[PDB]
Scaffold this active site. Sequence first.
Site, mmCIF file in Angstrom:
data_model
loop_
_atom_site.group_PDB
_atom_site.id
_atom_site.type_symbol
_atom_site.label_atom_id
_atom_site.label_comp_id
_atom_site.label_asym_id
_atom_site.label_seq_id
_atom_site.Cartn_x
_atom_site.Cartn_y
_atom_site.Cartn_z
ATOM 1 N N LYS A 1 0.938 -1.130 0.178
ATOM 2 C CA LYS A 1 0.041 0.009 0.156
ATOM 3 C C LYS A 1 1.032 1.358 0.067
ATOM 4 O O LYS A 1 1.556 1.352 1.022
ATOM 5 C CB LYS A 1 -0.960 -0.003 1.233
ATOM 6 C CG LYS A 1 -1.902 1.356 1.365
ATOM 7 C CD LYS A 1 -3.259 0.895 0.659
ATOM 8 C CE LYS A 1 -4.330 1.889 0.949
ATOM 9 N NZ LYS A 1 -3.932 3.289 0.267
ATOM 10 N N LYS B 1 4.617 2.090 9.153
ATOM 11 C CA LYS B 1 3.061 2.426 9.575
ATOM 12 C C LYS B 1 2.217 1.298 9.597
ATOM 13 O O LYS B 1 1.295 1.154 10.387
ATOM 14 C CB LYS B 1 2.759 3.669 8.979
ATOM 15 C CG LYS B 1 3.520 4.756 8.935
ATOM 16 C CD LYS B 1 3.235 5.929 7.964
ATOM 17 C CE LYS B 1 2.045 6.597 7.942
ATOM 18 N NZ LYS B 1 2.312 7.910 8.488
ATOM 19 N N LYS C 1 5.506 2.776 -2.627
ATOM 20 C CA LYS C 1 5.386 4.264 -2.883
ATOM 21 C C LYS C 1 5.564 4.288 -4.183
ATOM 22 O O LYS C 1 6.102 3.468 -4.956
ATOM 23 C CB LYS C 1 6.595 4.584 -1.982
ATOM 24 C CG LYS C 1 6.358 6.057 -1.913
ATOM 25 C CD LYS C 1 5.116 6.712 -0.973
ATOM 26 C CE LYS C 1 4.942 8.270 -1.118
ATOM 27 N NZ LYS C 1 4.184 8.661 0.296
ATOM 28 N N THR D 1 -6.188 12.231 10.110
ATOM 29 C CA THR D 1 -4.849 12.640 10.871
ATOM 30 C C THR D 1 -5.227 13.271 12.280
ATOM 31 O O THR D 1 -4.693 13.031 13.370
ATOM 32 C CB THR D 1 -3.828 13.414 10.221
ATOM 33 O OG1 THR D 1 -4.708 14.502 9.427
ATOM 34 C CG2 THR D 1 -3.263 12.437 9.071
ATOM 35 N N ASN E 1 -4.485 24.372 10.120
ATOM 36 C CA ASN E 1 -5.364 23.144 9.782
ATOM 37 C C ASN E 1 -5.270 22.069 10.871
ATOM 38 O O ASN E 1 -6.278 22.255 11.516
ATOM 39 C CB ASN E 1 -4.548 22.649 8.381
ATOM 40 C CG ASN E 1 -5.167 21.368 8.019
ATOM 41 O OD1 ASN E 1 -4.490 20.429 8.019
ATOM 42 N ND2 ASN E 1 -6.458 21.284 7.640
ATOM 43 N N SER F 1 -7.521 4.657 4.926
ATOM 44 C CA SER F 1 -7.362 4.077 3.466
ATOM 45 C C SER F 1 -7.620 2.600 3.549
ATOM 46 O O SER F 1 -8.142 2.049 2.382
ATOM 47 C CB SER F 1 -5.904 4.466 2.816
ATOM 48 O OG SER F 1 -5.858 5.779 2.312
#
Lengths: 490, 117, 410, 410
Positions: free
Chosen positions: D66, D90, D102, D186, D217, D344
Amino acid sequence: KPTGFMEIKREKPAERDPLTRLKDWKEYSAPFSEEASKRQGARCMDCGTPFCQIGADINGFTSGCPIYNLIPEWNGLVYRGRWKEALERLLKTNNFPEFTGRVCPAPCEGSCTLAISDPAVSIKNIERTIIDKGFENGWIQPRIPKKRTGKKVAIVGSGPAGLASADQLNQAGHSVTVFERADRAGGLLTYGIPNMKLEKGIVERRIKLLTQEGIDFVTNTEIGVDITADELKEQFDAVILCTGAQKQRDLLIEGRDSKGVHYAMDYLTLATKSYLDSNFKDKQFIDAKGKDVIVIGGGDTGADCVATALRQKAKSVHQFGKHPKLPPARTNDNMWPEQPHVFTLEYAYEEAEAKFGRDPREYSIQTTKMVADKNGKLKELHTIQMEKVKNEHGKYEFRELPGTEKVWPAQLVFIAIGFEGTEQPLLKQFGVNSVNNKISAAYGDYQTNIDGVFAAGDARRGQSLIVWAINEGREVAREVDRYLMGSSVL
Amino acid sequence: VSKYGKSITEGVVKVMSKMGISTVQSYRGAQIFEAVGISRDVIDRYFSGTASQLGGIDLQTIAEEAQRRHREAYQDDYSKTLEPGSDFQWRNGGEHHAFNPKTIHTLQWACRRNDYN
Amino acid sequence: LDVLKSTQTVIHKALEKLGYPEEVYELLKEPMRLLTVKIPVRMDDGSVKIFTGYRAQHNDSVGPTKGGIRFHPNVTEKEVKALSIWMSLKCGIIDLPYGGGKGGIVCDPRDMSFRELERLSRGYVRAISQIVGPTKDVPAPDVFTNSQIMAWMMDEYSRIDEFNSPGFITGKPLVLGGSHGRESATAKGVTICIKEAAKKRGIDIKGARVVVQGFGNAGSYLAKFMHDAGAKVVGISDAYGGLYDPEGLDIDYLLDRRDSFGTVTKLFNDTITNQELLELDCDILVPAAIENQITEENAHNIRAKIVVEAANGPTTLEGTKILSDRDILLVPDVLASAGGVTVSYFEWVQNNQGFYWSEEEVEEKLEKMMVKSFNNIYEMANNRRIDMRLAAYMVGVRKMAEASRFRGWI
Amino acid sequence: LDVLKSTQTVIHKALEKLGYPEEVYELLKEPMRLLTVKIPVRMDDGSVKIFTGYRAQHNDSVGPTKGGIRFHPNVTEKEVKALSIWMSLKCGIIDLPYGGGKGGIVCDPRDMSFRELERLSRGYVRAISQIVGPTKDVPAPDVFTNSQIMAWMMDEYSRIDEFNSPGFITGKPLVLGGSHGRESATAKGVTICIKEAAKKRGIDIKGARVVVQGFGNAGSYLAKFMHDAGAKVVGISDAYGGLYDPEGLDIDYLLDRRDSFGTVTKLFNDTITNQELLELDCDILVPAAIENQITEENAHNIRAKIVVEAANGPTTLEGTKILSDRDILLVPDVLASAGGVTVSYFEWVQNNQGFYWSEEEVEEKLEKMMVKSFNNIYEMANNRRIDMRLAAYMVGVRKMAEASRFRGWI
Ligand SMILES: Cc1cc2nc3c(=O)[nH]c(=O)nc-3n(C[C@H](O)[C@H](O)[C@H](O)COP(=O)(O)OP(=O)(O)OC[C@H]3O[C@@H](n4cnc5c(N)ncnc54)[C@H](O)[C@@H]3O)c2cc1C
Ligand code: SF4
Ligand code: SF4
């Protein structure tokens, strides 16, 4: 099938004219050019069992290289034009080839196969050329031994034996120290050997290289009252003894008391020290430019004294020697393997012959002296002829000739009729024994009576040469390394 | 490399010709070598058919020699040069030679003097 | 270090001469699919070693990529890309329906073993199985590779795809779908090029003097072919030297005494070195041996009217320039040594059909293909006052550029 | 300095602490697949431009890789490989059935047009179609990439595979098979990390003196979420300095429609204390303004009982060691910023099932996953007497190492 020894003749490199050579205290010889060196190396036959490498005493005289130099090997390398390889092979054995290339009398040249019915090859000149080329190209740099194990040997004496031992131990990985009494290190090389034969610049450069290596020389130390053997042993594992041999024998005869008689060692030391300090301007030496010079006792010391007097422009200089003059050719009982005993006419004599026109002569022989003058300064010197005769059982003995009485003017006298062992019993702090002023030791296994103390050099060998000192130093370095660690490659 | 190979092969051919063997195929099986200083036990174990009149050293000694040479070579922490050989020439500190300079000059001097000591 | 730059330069020069724009060069300078993989291999000692593998595919517009795999420790991405481009050039020169491909593995087969080599080959095939196949990428052997390795790769691919795939990889043994003439392919192509060059220059092959530098399999087969054709071989060379005989060298006896490595020289007989072998009087010269042999000094001393570069890069730019000045016909390696690629293509065709040809069929087809390529290159180099090397490069790039333009990639 | 080398070093120390051989590190230090491709794109002016693209796959032992894709001109092979390794870490931390992946393209979308970007994305998908899919490699968005690009990629892959493949790529719009909670992923993750850290410690969420170096943000979002129960003390690094310094006072909810482009929330001319305030006796710390704000000099100056990282590389090794010695809890960024990856993964699961969840389900599943990961990391760190960062790294690499050993690659 080389034929160089047949189709090539021996030659010599550039040499300054003797007449003009007395105006400057510099080298009296130059290295061979490339072509000349190649031609001279072509002469060597790649000797089978080279007699130029035996390095041993034959009939009381040394023959060959005592340090086992690879003379045929670098001769061939020079002929082929390989200079780096020649220098490397040379340094494999000799760690100070610069001194030997211009100081050693080259007994190897005398004890070589080509020496029979033909001149030998210029081994000394080839060695000098190799080392000079290496220095000029800058191939000689400190090795900087990466491996350094905490160990101290504290060599005493800066003579060639001391320098060689220090270099060997440093390369092994031991941090050593070299104690010297005089201001400048180098032992005999710095002071005893004239600047003419060996300028001290190369010596100082060698000490600089050794210091960069890490020898850490210390000067101005008599290591007597200044430093004691007890604390030496306490603070060091081994101490060695490279004390050399500076004791000089005298003549126990009447008349040797008037002022004007000084040791050849002292005179040469003072002259060279003044030249190095203020170019013989401090007037802290002996000068006889207008005074007659009589040097009694031939040899290297006598030749050096004569050369010094000639450069000082003494009005008259004379050399005395009891032993008879050498013949121009080998005698029946003196063939090639033995060191030749023929007429040489080395430096300090051709200069005198060329310069002196009123008295174009030298080498007064068959007479040393007898009772001299008195009442203050020297006025005259008495000499009587001596002859070698066979007596009792065919043994050489000296007989004086009553009818040959003669006198010469002598305002300055030098004694060089021999030498004695090391400085004993002055240095009696150690328990080392002696028999004839030489500390008791044997070639190989240099251990003395005291553990951790090793004899070395002229101190145990008597009177020897620089190559002998280097060889001895290498052996003691190997022995002390083995004693300290158990194993020693060299 | 090619010249070395050809010269070595020619030398081996000469070695075979010494005994009269004309073919490497036969020479390979044949043992045309005789040991001098090898124990008969070792010979029988590994060199069967070879001759050793006086026997000699053992496998332990052979291994010790090999290990010694290897160890000194691998340590060798003084010099970056190969030691001179003494197989077909005499060098100070090298292998002993019967006709050394000392013997040669002593014999010549004795014969020229007609002297006995 | 500059192999990729040199390949890029020759591609640029060929495209400029052909008149194509700069976008074609931008597309063809680098491959559009480069894959780097890590292969874990279990060794005999029981440990695990990670090898690095590369696979580059220059183009696929013409058809499936065709390439080779080499087992060397000095392989690199730049070398792989450059050799893929060179393979594309060869395929374009021969007019094959192929692209350029190249595989490589960082390893030392000398230290590796039989089972370790098998495991490494299988692992490489697995790592690249996602982008290769009979319709995508066809590998072949190169340095330190052979029919056994090709068979291992083929078995791996069939074991992955659940059905036999002989056409996925070439260079296989006959029993597994190999093709006849896999050993004499390069020599036969060199022979065809030599005959065509002699015909063009008016030299009659009957009685023509031929010198061959190198007596490996290629050299031996080439000498046999010249002898059969009637040309006289006046010089051969091996690892130990060479021989010279203007009236003939008895190629039959030389081949009879030839060993596995190709040595034919006697032991106690002096030989002729390669430097003076190249300078012998002959009509045809064929270096099939080590590279960088012809330079400025020996270019003027060479007396051969035709020179054929059987090996890889046996001539330099200065030597080529001097030969062109002297009017010596040079046949480039990129054309002469295409017999192996052509035979691999024939093997692929046979695998696709299921029908396997014979030696005579392979011979005739190779003859026609090589003759057509040589004639096209010669006509190009005569129409344009350039060298055969540049003409061959232009012929190689033309097909790929036209296919890309037609497919719309540029 | 080298990001790749730093990643290899952290992997090495984590594996050494876990007690694994060196072959595991040799396998996991470098990705096992690196595809480099050239994409021809027809620009709006009629010209053709060649773009460079990279795709790295690190380990497929656990499951399909992924990875995100970024459209930047400064991308490189080393950066792509390092980011793939970080993604694998992760995924291992969150216990997902994924590997490291990636991708990247050397381009400037600011200069590229809409149609040009569509064509570039389609070409990238066409180039890498052989080694990607719902079962091999799952792309996702990154910087300069968004749901429109994801949708174009999905359409291209669906056309290639002849059927709809929503699960091949994540980050899609809702109509095409997107998932809820993508935007706030996040921020929500950091909120759960903060809550779990406070629960583990003796601190409650009522007072909760909170220092934040954000206010942009993510910082504004987390501050707003905290404001419901906790309080505020000071806000720092609002793109202009210490513009906010309540020093023991709260802030009214001002998240309706406000941005830092014009002023911050009320006015740019308000009193400003200085750029760096820090200090103060707070109980929660959220530093996210720039890389490596905390250093040795100011490591002991901070007075926060809990620190939660919300940016990339906000703290150094010396600072982490100092905080661990002082017994201040430190939540690594690699764990704090895993909400996007988790969402995701949820989108991928929804695509596989055909059933699409709601916001509440997404939130509760995210809470469960992040709480489990935090508890595992905290327990292992306590057991090994080490820092949270190292514990997280070891937890991440453990799954990959065990999977590789089980599968027999090492
Ligand atoms: C061409 C030629 C010419 C020669 N000319 C001469 C000459 O004119 N005179 C001569 O004597 N030899 C001469 N020699 C011989 C040669 O100089 C010596 O044989 C040799 O150099 C002495 O070796 P060494 O290692 O003992 O050196 P040394 O110099 O003897 O080593 C010891 C050094 O340390 C000093 N020293 C003494 N006691 C101590 C102590 N307690 N602590 C520290 N240092 C101390 C000594 O004074 C000396 O300087 C000549 C040789 C040749 C080949
Ligand atoms: S000149 Fe000296 S070194 Fe040379 S071969 Fe003759 S004896 Fe040996
Ligand atoms: S050091 Fe003396 S004996 Fe040795 S080679 Fe040189 S000159 Fe000859």
